[PDB]
DNA sequence: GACCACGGCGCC
DNA sequence: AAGGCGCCGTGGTC
């Protein structure tokens, strides 16, 4: 089938990185298949000129690496896209060739041919599935090319205060190493949790509570120290110790060398096909969970800067779950409380009650995850769904459903399969029921905010701003200062109104120079 | 160098 | 709020 290159448009491309990090990669090898034919390039970085769009196999992480060399090369139809709505367990190149009539070699023509073949399959199993195909055409095939366009700007990020910040932090680390090593009487590896096992509940003869879930060792989360906060002065030493210590290995060192020589900016990957739900991951490296919470945590956050020029707009829906379990179940009441304007929590104390069955938390952790009277704690979760009677049905319903099709789906029907709901272990079965009952509501949120990325950035590109981060209930742009606040207007209406449920969909929206400044 | 399992923990 | 993730250091292996 071999033949020159270049291929005639449309046709499926194959391509190899060094390494799976678009931004980072070389591009040791292209090719395309079409009509019988396979077209190899002798040289990949001049023919990748010659594609109008990139049609395969990992579409986006081939663009991404076009926009890095200043190309506009969009992604188009991806198999894998297609597998991940069929089946969201479809994660991976490796499976999906596997299971759908291939192999994912190592060669750029074979994972062209590849990619052909895929597609003629996978979209042969999608026929009849409308809303499948609706979620691929509306949602998740054009959602591609957004994607793209973030990986490939970055984020600008404060370096030098960063190194400031880990020497700093340094210094408070060795203070609370030494005093740790002093009242365990003697000097141990502090980030060594079975060494803290033993020093803690053999040598200090401390209290041993919970176990880890796989090795059955005396645990030492914090959870577990946390009870054992007055029991022991070192307990609130490593406490400490792991807060500055995790933040410090996670975020303070590792983000600063990872700024791009060409670019100057930091940049992530958004994963399209790696949950279940139908939320995006964010890797390499993760820019979902930068800290927040504590004060250091705040720290790190304020590292994330816009351009000279610019500002950040970070827009957060509010209670998007909540909101969305109020529609899917069709619960009168808790619509009515959206509905009225009024906060439903009032309507983290009585929060998270209400946060509380969106997984059907333990009536027990409710004592602890909330420090109640335990077995009164157990005595309003009946009054709970006795305000709210729409919403046990509809767990239930999802439930029943979701045992007899193996799956359970969100409101645009993506679906998720979930077998163990009718195993015979109490605690897997019920694992899989709180699984099980989720995904309809995480989903949709997923659903609702990708919706909302793939309508709002072709508006900001007419108004030159940028989309940089989604972390998926929020979302951060990056636009000129003298555009800023049309640009936080503008987004703002666009994600309330991405599709009107039986209550409103509310966002909050800040302007800033920094990611943290820009909430507040 | 590389991979993996685990406990642990950061965010939504 | 913390079912859904990804990264850390450790500990073990090839
Ligand atoms: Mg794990």
Redo the contacts with the bound molecule.
Sequence with gaps: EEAPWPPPEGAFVGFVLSRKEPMWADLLALAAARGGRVHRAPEPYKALRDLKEARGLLAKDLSVLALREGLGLPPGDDPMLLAYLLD?SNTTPEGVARRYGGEWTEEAGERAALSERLFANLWGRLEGEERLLWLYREVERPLSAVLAHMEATGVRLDVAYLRALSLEVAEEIARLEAEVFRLAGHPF?????????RVLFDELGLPAI????????????????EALREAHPIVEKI?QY??L???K??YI??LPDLIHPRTGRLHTRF?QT????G?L??????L???????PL?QRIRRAFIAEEGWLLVAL?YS????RVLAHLSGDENLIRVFQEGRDIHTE?AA??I???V????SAH?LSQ??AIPYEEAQAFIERYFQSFPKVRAWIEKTLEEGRRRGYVETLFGRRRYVPDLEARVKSVRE?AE??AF??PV?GTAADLMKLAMVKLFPRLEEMGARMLLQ????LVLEAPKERAEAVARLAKEVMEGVYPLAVPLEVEVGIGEDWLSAKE
């Design positions: 969201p590896n502090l980030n060594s949790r079975d060494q803290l096992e919970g176990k880890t879930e796989k090795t059955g060792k005396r645990s030492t989360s914090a959870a577990v120290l406490l792991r807060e210590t995790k933040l290995s996670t060192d590792p994963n790696a949950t279940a739900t939320r991951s964010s890797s390499d490296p993760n979902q969970n930068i800290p927040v919470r504590t945590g957060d209670q998007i779950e909540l983290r929060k998270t209400n946060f509380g969106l997984y059907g938390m952790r995850e909330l694992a709180r699984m989720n995904m995480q972390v998926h209930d929020e």
